[PDB]
Amino acid sequence: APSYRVKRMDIAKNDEECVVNAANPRGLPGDGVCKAVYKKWPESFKNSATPVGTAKTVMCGTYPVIHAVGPNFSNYSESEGDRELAAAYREVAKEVTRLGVNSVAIPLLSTGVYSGGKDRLTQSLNHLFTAMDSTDADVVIYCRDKEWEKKISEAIQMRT
Numbered sequence: 001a002p003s004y005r006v007k008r009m010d011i012a013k014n015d016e017e018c019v020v021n022a023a024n025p026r027g028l029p030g031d032g033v034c035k036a037v038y039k040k041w042p043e044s045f046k047n048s049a050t051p052v053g054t055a056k057t058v059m060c061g062t063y064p065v066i067h068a069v070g071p072n073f074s075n076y077s078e079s080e081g082d083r084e085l086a087a088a089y090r091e092v093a094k095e096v097t098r099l100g101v102n103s104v105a106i107p108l109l110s111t112g113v114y115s116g117g118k119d120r121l122t123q124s125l126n127h128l129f130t131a132m133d134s135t136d137a138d139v140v141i142y143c144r145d146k147e148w149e150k151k152i153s154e155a156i157q158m159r160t
């Protein structure tokens with residue numbers, strides 16, 4: 001029976017069969033979540049470029065890294081950002097399904113330096129659920145904040 005779970009830890013130390021990188025559309029290393037991911041799976045950055053609202057898988061040995069590009073809300077309108085954020089999660093669901101994995105480690109896309117300085121915990125998490133509800137993978141959501149951990153945990157709890 002597939003679960004959602006949340007872990008307050010470095011996604012680069014995930015115990016899942018594949019990882020989602022919070023990527024830039026240029027396929028560049030970056031800083032934060034992308035940094036740790038670059039350090040752990042640097043070969044996965046070969047031709048990792050993919051447009052905003054898309055996801056592209058690059059293998060690191062046999063370990064899949066799914067580079068998912070949420071929108072930078074600084075650059076987008078609220079309505080266009082929302083569309084691109086939903087689309088990115090949909091493409092994650094497709095790659096997870098295509099790869100046949102039993103589990104996936106996923107961050108909340110567009111909630112850090114791409115948030116346009118807004119709290120998008122609820123917006124981003126609900127787009128993740130919409131996409132991942134049609135898959136059979138165990139989903140483990142990674143965050144850093146102690147609060148976010150609690151709010152994500154409660155939103156998981158009150159669907160079950």
Ligand SMILES: COC(=O)c1nc(=O)[nH]c2ccccc12
Pocket residue numbers: 022023024030031032033034068069070071107108109110111112113114115
């Ligand atoms: C995960 O939190 C973010 O703000 C974020 N989301 C992305 O979808 N791509 C990124 C790329 C570089 C930096 C941050 C991001």
